[PDB]
Amino acid sequence: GIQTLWTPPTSNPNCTVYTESDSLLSLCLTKCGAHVLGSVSLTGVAGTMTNMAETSLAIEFTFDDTGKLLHSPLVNNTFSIRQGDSPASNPTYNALAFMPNSTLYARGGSGEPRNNYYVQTYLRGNVQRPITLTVTFNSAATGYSLSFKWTAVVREKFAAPATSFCYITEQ
Amino acid sequence: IQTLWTPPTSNPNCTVYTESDSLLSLCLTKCGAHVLGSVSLTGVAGTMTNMAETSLAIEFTFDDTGKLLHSPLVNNTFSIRQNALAFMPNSTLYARGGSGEPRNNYYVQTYLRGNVQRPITLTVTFNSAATGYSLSFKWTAVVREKFAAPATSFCYITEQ
Amino acid sequence: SGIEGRPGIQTLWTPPTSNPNCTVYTESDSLLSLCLTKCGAHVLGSVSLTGVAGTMTNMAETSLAIEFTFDDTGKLLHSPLVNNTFYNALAFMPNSTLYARGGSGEPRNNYYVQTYLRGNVQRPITLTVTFNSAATGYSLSFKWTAVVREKFAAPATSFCYITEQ
Ligand SMILES: CC(=O)N[C@H]1[C@H]([C@H](O)[C@H](O)CO)O[C@@](O[C@H](CO)[C@@H](O)[C@@H]2O[C@@](O)(C(=O)O)C[C@H](O)[C@H]2NC(C)=O)(C(=O)O)C[C@@H]1O
Ligand SMILES: CC(=O)N[C@H]1[C@H]([C@H](O)[C@H](O)CO)O[C@@](O)(C(=O)O)C[C@@H]1O
């Protein structure tokens, strides 16, 4: 039943890029065989996220060698199984079935082209503002990781539209 | 049930400007909280072969139970492949009436007719409709040229 | 083997490798990752290709193409894999009604991906994935643009097609 790891859809800020609860992140990973299908978007809500000082923005989810979450930008690290996918309390799952394959995407391999997945989108959906999202698999030297870097425009609000990506899993 | 689609076909099944003027492929497959969608649209007759406008938009609208209300298909062929809300775009993340919100939009780069001199954008929008659910597609087009949009795909989080 | 199927069968893939497994111009000159997973009527595909040796590290042409060709039962006939060897195979084949055989000239038989050579944004390239270019049986073709006198590597990408069964 457990095919999904996500942060729950919400209309309230749930993410901290520069200051607490300054943004609304969606991240969802669903398993289809040896693939994870991932979706992500990030909307600035407050502070610097509404008036950027830098030309790029990056966040990262890191996991240990068992697939257990170590760090994320989410307020209260609300990244877990989707509720209702198991009738049991405290549902167990194989977290490695959602981790990026460590043979194809070597740890510490952010400089390797095959560890990176590139997405073209538009800042705030404005078609005069093309930006790139770079998703990197296993940048971290130990454990597993998913890293997201978007290009951005200074002195404007940041928001990245709905996007998606796909990687091969460890198990 | 894992798949909602219009069945593969090689003859026109879709009405953009006039009856059966185009061939639409649309297929939605459920994987956990995601739908993986594929779409393409090939002009076959009439204005679809000699465009009058510089964009083309079609929409699938559903009621609040996930039942199809309208689409550009010639016949009622959008169907389960031989819980509707499990295929609908999430209405918390993609707010109804939210076509103007960036997170309700998914952008795809492709090429008109597969022509490298004709880069175009497909915008897929989730829940543009004020009520119920919707999937909307809008492609750039070139006037006085044929319209065809190659194979593309997209992904969204579901309601249930 | 070169392509292996995993559980009934939901995944066809090149097994993960640290070493070259593919022959574009010369034997074992590249590392290919190709993975096809069945999700209802879709295959979700991922692909990347890293040059390791020879012309792959110093390109002579502005594009590179490889193809996986299958017979009408879905059996693998040929691929660029070093280990050129390999369940309802038709469940993984591109749909021959929508993607007609010999139809590489039909826009709907082609899926375009924008990416960056060696992950360098000053080097935009396109991947064209084509379904059923073969006049008989089934096929998946991959063509990337490239830059002469530079090393070839195409980053992680993905694509999706409707299946025959
Ligand atoms: C994902 C990523 O970070 N990609 C970068 C790649 C990549 O790290 C390497 O290709 C992996 O081996 O490197 C890019 O820069 C390279 C080297 O880092 C170039 O600047 C080349 O540097 C040289 O020193 C080299 O060949 O090593 C000289 C060479 O002439 C340079 N290449 C050119 C043609 O600019 C890369 O483009 O490969 C940057 C990329 O973002
Ligand atoms: C999807 C969409 O329509 N995007 C539009 C956005 C958003 O509607 C607002 O940012 C919502 O707050 O508004 C713009 O003025 C912008 O910010 O550049 C133009 C852009 O085309």
UniProtKB/TrEMBL annotation, chain C:
Source species, domain of life: Viruses
Signal sequence annotation: none
Coiled coil feature spans: none
Subcellular location, record wording: Host nucleus; Virion
Domain Adenoviral fibre protein knob as annotated: residue spans: 10-165
Residue stretches spanning the membrane: none
Family according to the record: Belongs to the adenoviridae fiber family.
Protein name in the entry: Fiber-1
Organism of this sequence: human adenovirus 52
Lineage: Viruses, Varidnaviria, Bamfordvirae, Preplasmiviricota, Polisuviricotina
Full-length numbering of the shown residues: 193 to 363 of 363
